[PDB]
């Protein structure tokens, strides 16, 4: 079964804050995690991030990430 953003961030040190998360079909965009609002079960929650366009930061203040519980998320090992 595929993993959402929370189920990927469980196998990450410091809960994935500081890492670049992206959906699997995305091509050249990721979010740099700033806050994770974990729920009770440990598999669902919210997320806040910094958007990066082509590896370059495009926004100043973080924003809440849409589609966190969609089972298509991954972390980029190269950008982070």
């Amino acid at each position: 079964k595929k993993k959402n953003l929370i189920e990927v961030a469980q196998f990450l040190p410091n809960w994935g804050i500081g890492y670049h998360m992206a959906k699997a079909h995305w091509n050249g965009v990721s979010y740099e995690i700033t806050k994770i609002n974990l729920y009770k079960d440990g598999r669902h929650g919210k997320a806040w991030g910094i958007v990066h366009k082509d590896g370059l930061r495009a926004a100043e203040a973080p924003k809440k990430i849409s589609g966190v519980h969609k089972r298509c998320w991954k972390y980029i090992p190269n950008l982070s």
């Binding site: 469980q10 196998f11 410091n14 974990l38």
Partner: protein, 310 residues
């Protein structure tokens, strides 16, 4: 299967976390660490760590991993009982237990590997160090050279000495002594003078065991004059504190050194080295007694060794 301190401690935690929804005291986690006794009870400890990490983020809003000493102690407890797989899981960079890999956890794993004579456990612990991006340190080099002394692994010596020298670490005196004495055990003369040159680049003045190994390398060339001068200048520059230790090392010459240096040769080279040592080491003892050194040796142990009749 579980020890009862541990089943009770695990529960009191998984009950605070899950039923009361409040953080337990740290003492309960630390006593679950201190009271682990058998291999099966540290799966209970890892379940506790996962549940406490989930609670720390979920209720306390703590993203951070478990701190350094806690990771040191969970690794040393995982290896004190003797579960090495979950012991080496503390070196993983990506884990659901909040464990930060450190040099100290690898030092515990390599201390076990030294104390239990485990040669491949070097290879897994060092591949875990490289995989999980931890830096290479002089104490790691100390432990690695000490274990590959005791396991008859020259390939590990060459590979990891190249890795450590490329990494730019500063090797201590003791690991240099271990390297020179093991190359004396094996008989690589060119490597012996190579590491002597490298340590002369590193430090200036010789110590006991390395001038000792230099004398071993010169005696392998059947040139007892330079060896005698080297141990002369290392004996003059000491007080009389280690008079029993130098006699113990001369007993090491007359007991254990020829066996170790002729296990790794061929049979005609065994005959040649047996004859060469039988010609040189009585002259070496007579030279040392002539130069003024009062050293108690057993020359009968030359013929009492079962290796030296090859």
């Amino acid at each position: 299967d579980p020890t009862e301190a541990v089943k009770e401690l695990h529960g009191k935690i998984l009950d605070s976390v899950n039923v009361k929804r409040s953080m337990p005291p740290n003492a309960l986690l630390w006593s679950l660490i201190e009271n682990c006794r058998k291999e099966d009870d540290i799966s209970f400890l890892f379940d506790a760590l996962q549940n406490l990490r989930r609670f720390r983020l979920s209720n306390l809003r703590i993203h951070d991993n478990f701190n350094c000493n806690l990771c040191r102690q969970v690794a040393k407890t995982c290896v004190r009982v003797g579960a090495i797989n979950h012991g080496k899981r503390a070196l993983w960079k990506h884990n659901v237990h909040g464990l930060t890999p450190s040099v100290a956890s690898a030092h515990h794993l390599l201390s076990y590997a030294l104390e239990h004579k485990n040669s491949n456990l070097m290879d897994e612990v060092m591949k875990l160090l490289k995989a999980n991006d931890l830096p290479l340190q002089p104490g790691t080099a100390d432990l690695v050279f000490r274990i590959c002394h005791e396991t008859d692994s020259w390939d590990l010596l060459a590979k990891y000495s190249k890795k450590f020298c490329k990494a730019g670490v500063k090797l201590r005196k003791t690991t240099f002594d271990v390297w020179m004495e093991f190359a004396a055990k094996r008989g690589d003369t060119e490597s012996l003078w190579k590491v002597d040159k490298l340590r002369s680049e590193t430090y200036t003045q010789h110590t006991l065991s390395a001038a000792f190994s230099c004398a071993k390398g010169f005696l392998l060339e059947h040139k007892p004059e330079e060896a005698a001068a080297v141990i002369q200048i290392i004996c003059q520059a000491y007080p009389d504190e280690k008079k029993s230790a130098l006699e113990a090392e001369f007993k090491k010459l007359v007991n254990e050194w020829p066996v170790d240096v002729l296990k790794h040769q061929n049979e005609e080279d065994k005959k040649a080295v047996a004859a060469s040592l039988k010609s040189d080491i009585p002259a070496m003892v007579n030279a040392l007694v002539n130069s003024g050194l009062r050293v108690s040796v057993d020359l009968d142990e030359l013929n009492k060794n079962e290796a030296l009749l090859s």
